[PDB]
């Protein structure tokens, strides 16, 4: 009879991650970790410390790769009418997805566990001012890390910067990238070949016939420095505009000045590049573009009738 099954998850120390798993492809058979303010050690099969190979996990649908050392739980040998304890240590490695949201001071794993540290914590040029909730000795950034795939057993030639964090339950590792050019608070949504811009009533109206949408903006431009983490907008807008101009308007039109930035009601950031023929805050965006479409529709019809009827008036007059 099972009288109790204590199942725990312990982190793998750095010196076992780098020296053993990443280098030799093996993992220690004993887990030595601090739990509940006490340094416990667990020996696999109640036996001596050993290096065990990491073999691929059984295939499951729509799941990332996994490796484990032991597949069978060890239970004590039978002794008549005696409570007997048996240990089983299984060293597990799982590639997972990790997700973060603004302000990117904490990120989540696909297992539903959290890691209370910014994904971009590091060692170079202010990469240590990012939020951390753990002690400084729980973090280790190995610079120039040679990842060795545990299936193909081939060492990657190009080194990468690898953050490692030893949480009380597990140990995460991920490639390090700078925060500023990786995240953004704005996403490129649409590319408009012909965005006609008009000025009227101290406002700019940008009308796109391709998608049937009219935005309204204040006369002034939008200070791009005001956008938090706004390093992606410039690059994306420039690349898109260059591609699109090369695709269509190279032979007939020319660019006029640097791309301008305007803010449109509902929270839409329009980068506009004018053409001539050869002759710190976070912006909240509405979830329904429909109003703008309506505007364009109401504009279009109106304009036409306000033309046609007007001609009739003159035609009547004469």
């Amino acid at each position: 009879q099972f009288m109790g099954i204590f199942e725990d998850r312990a982190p793998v120390p750095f010196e076992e991650v780098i020296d053993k798993i990443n280098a030799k492809g093996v993992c220690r058979s004993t887990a030595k970790y601090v739990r509940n303010n006490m340094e416990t050690t667990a020996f696999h099969r109640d036996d001596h410390e050993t290096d065990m190979e990491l073999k691929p996990a059984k295939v499951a649908t729509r799941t990332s790769r996994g490796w484990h050392t032991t597949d069978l739980k060890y239970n004590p040998s039978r002794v008549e009418a005696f409570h007997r304890y048996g240990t089983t240590v299984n060293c597990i490695v799982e590639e997972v997805d990790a997700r973060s949201v603004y302000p990117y001071d904490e990120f989540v794993l696909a297992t539903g566990d959290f890691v209370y540290m910014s994904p971009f914590y590091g060692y170079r040029e202010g990469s240590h001012t990012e939020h951390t909730s753990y002690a400084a000795d729980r973090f280790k950034q190995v610079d120039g890390f040679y990842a060795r795939d545990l299936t193909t057993k081939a060492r990657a030639t190009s080194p990468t910067t690898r953050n490692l964090l030893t949480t009380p339950k597990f140990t995460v590792a991920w490639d390090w990238v700078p925060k500023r050019p990786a995240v953004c608070t704005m996403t490129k949504w649409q590319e408009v070949d012909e965005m006609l811009r008009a000025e009227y009533g101290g406002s700019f109206r940008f009308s796109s016939d391709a998608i049937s949408t009219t935005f309204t903006t204040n006369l002034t431009q939008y200070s791009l420095s005001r956008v938090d983490l706004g390093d992606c907008i410039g690059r994306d807008a420039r690349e898109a505009i260059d591609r699109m101009f090369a695709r269509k308007y190279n032979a007939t039109h020319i660019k006029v000045g640097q791309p301008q930035y305007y803010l449109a009601t509902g929270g839409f950031l329009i980068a506009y590049q004018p053409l001539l023929s050869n002759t710190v805050e976070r912006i909240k965006t509405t979830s329904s573009i429909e109003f703008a479409r309506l505007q364009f529709t109401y504009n279009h019809i109106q304009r036409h009738v306000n033309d046609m009827l007007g001609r009739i008036a003159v035609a009547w007059c004469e």
Partner: antibody
Amino acid sequence: TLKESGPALVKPTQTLTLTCTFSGFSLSTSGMSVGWIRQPPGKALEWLAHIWWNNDKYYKPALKSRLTISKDTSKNQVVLTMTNMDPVDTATYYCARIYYGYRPYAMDYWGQGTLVTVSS
Amino acid sequence: IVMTQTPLSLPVTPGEPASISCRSSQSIVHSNGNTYLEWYLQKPGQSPQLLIYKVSNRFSGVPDRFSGSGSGTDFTLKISRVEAEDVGVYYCFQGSHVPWSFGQGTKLEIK
């Protein structure tokens, strides 16, 4: 601002310890790192080790098995230990401070360095 | 990554430009997109001092004569007008990828 302290005469096959005293920075700020460097007389500079503010020590792989760098912020010092001394290691040792935490250039301020000779 | 500084000894008459080149076995490009290759100078009986960082940036307190360039695995220090005080040993050092290393260094000679 980085001092250099170490036995000038150490017999072969013995443990060696050094010390680097700081001034104007503490190895407890979020972006301080201190490195130990060696230069044999008349040969090129050789990087040996460096420690970050969070006890993240990195060694030279060739000398990994022997070097041991430790930090004590209470005294505001770094102790570099090199076991199994070898007369090939007679050289001048320098202590450097790194601003990779803040600037793209490392090893700005060096100590005067101390000459250590391995002989009986 | 191993740095190979060439030539080992560079005798140059004062006023004439001097060239030092070092090559690495592997790209010193970091995931930042920056190459942390820096040139240091050691004067006779003196602690070595940094001259150039990030290939093409001159450290504070360094005159315009020193100029770094290059990319990938090749890098070149150029002194447009060598002076009397330029005598010393020059090192190129890569910090992007642990383990770090210095080149063999080049000794300047004045003729």
